[PDB]
């Protein structure tokens, strides 16, 4: 999940709109 | 799991700033 | 307004931690 | 929803857990 | 400045970007 | 009232995120 | 990395309440 | 009230990097 | 208390101090 | 001893809404 | 203490609540 | 940089200051 994705290596804003509803 | 932890925290108000009106589903 | 989105970055915080593995819904 | 209820009277913590899944 | 930008009205992605180097 | 000094705390968190590697200027 | 990440957030909070009406620079 | 509530909040991250080694109270 | 004094107008790190040990 | 720094950061935050009117006293 | 208890592992509501007054 | 400083170690106030304008 976003958790997994993002907690190593930072996410960009593009990525973490992936997880909005 | 402390770490991820607090990686969730910022992630969660991340989201909320990026997702606006949207709102957002967080499931650990 | 502003005060309701300064309310909500924390409410967002209090649910993450209140909610824990359960995760939680929000939409503003 | 949770901001009409919790932003002006504070929500306690039964009350905010309400809110999870 | 920004305080009277941001903090009088939400500001957009786009509005915060303007903080930006 | 305290309303713009709490309201600036959000703001450079947030302008911290958007700004990314770009990084940022602020001044109150 | 994310820790850097976290830390930095943290650190323009401080700062926002340290330098005050000075601001401040900050490079992610 | 919230808005002192939320002041709180603040307040206690202030008071976390202001007293550092010595510790607050908070009520 | 802190609230009525650092809530109701900004409080400087230095008035901040008083509410250490 | 920063890792606990952060940590400490969102603890107090933390006990701030568990402990609602009762307070806390904290010392790292 | 709450940082050796907590920072270590995840305490719950109910353990960080041991700390209060 | 301020990273190596201060996400390695503790930084005080009067550390932060440095990084100031
Ligand atoms: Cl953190
Ligand atoms: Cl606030
Ligand atoms: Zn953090
Ligand atoms: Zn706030």
Same mark, same amino acid.
């Given at each position: 999940?976003?958790?997994? !994705? +993002? +907690?190593? %290596?930072? +996410? %960009?804003? &593009? !990525?973490?709109?992936? &997880? +909005?509803? | 799991? *402390?770490?991820?932890? $607090?990686?969730?925290?910022?992630? *969660? =108000? /991340?989201?909320? $700033? *990026?997702?606006? =009106?949207?709102? /957002?589903?967080?499931?650990?």
């Amino acid at each position: 999940g976003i958790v997994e !994705q +993002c +907690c190593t %290596s930072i +996410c %960009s804003l &593009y !990525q973490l709109e992936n &997880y +909005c509803n | 799991f *402390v770490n991820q932890h $607090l990686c969730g925290s910022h992630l *969660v =108000e /991340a989201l909320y $700033l *990026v997702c606006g =009106e949207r709102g /957002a589903f967080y499931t650990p």
